[PDB]
Ligand binder design. Sequence first.
Ligand SMILES: Cc1cc2nc3c(=O)[nH]c(=O)nc-3n(C[C@H](O)[C@H](O)[C@H](O)COP(=O)(O)O)c2cc1C
Ligand SMILES: Cc1cc2nc3c(=O)[nH]c(=O)nc-3n(C[C@H](O)[C@H](O)[C@H](O)COP(=O)(O)O)c2cc1C
Lengths: 106, 103
Amino acid sequence: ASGMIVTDAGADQPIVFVNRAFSTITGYAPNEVLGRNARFLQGPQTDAATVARLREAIAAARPIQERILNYRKDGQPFWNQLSISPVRDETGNVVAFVGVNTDVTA
Amino acid sequence: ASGMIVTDAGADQPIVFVNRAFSTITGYAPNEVLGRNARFLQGPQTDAATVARLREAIAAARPIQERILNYRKDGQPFWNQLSISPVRDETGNVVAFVGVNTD
Ligand SMILES: Cc1cc2nc3c(=O)[nH]c(=O)nc-3n(C[C@H](O)[C@H](O)[C@H](O)COP(=O)(O)O)c2cc1C
Ligand SMILES: Cc1cc2nc3c(=O)[nH]c(=O)nc-3n(C[C@H](O)[C@H](O)[C@H](O)COP(=O)(O)O)c2cc1C
């Protein structure tokens, strides 16, 4: 169904966990993405304005939803319905980010 | 630093990921918690009414916070400042649960 990406909150948000659906959608195994920023999913037809909105939202730890053009490991484009939210503790500290991916290419 | 627990949405919400602080707080390594329901952290003096509120919130995929008595691997009791929220896709399907153990 829907992919899930968990990243660290700091140091440019390296991936720390992906679910099985993430591999189904993107063609990447966990081994191939752990420790990397998720921006490797982008490529030349990705909308720069959309990437800028993601960058500013993540810097502010503000939830954001975007439809963004991404690329499978072998280079096949797909439309990623992407929702990112910070994970906060009760003091308001950001512990992680969680991203949900749906392939909406259909 | 605050602990984080990620579980699957269905079956019995098995743990699929914990952060470093989870191990600092609880004394459990990832290998000894992955695939288990987090209820193993509970013990003799855990408040049953608190557990029942968590049970109903998870069943309905509702956000909840509880201060719950838990036990470290070595059996020492500690107060877990626990907050749980569902992770949803845009069609409203629950993909996972995320728990935070606030430091
Ligand atoms: C939890 C999380 C999941 C993300 N998932 C994706 C994704 O699936 N596709 C994507 O293009 N970018 C994703 N990103 C965004 C990139 O990692 C990055 O934040 C974005 O490209 C903007 O920053 P940049 O301009 O430094 O690349 C995700 C970010 C986070 C924090
Ligand atoms: C993501 C997540 C994290 C959880 N973390 C804890 C925890 O740290 N301590 C705890 O006692 N219960 C925790 N729980 C709750 C138990 O897993 C379980 O839902 C609760 O005991 C109520 O269900 P039960 O009556 O079937 O045990 C967590 C649940 C979820 C979904």
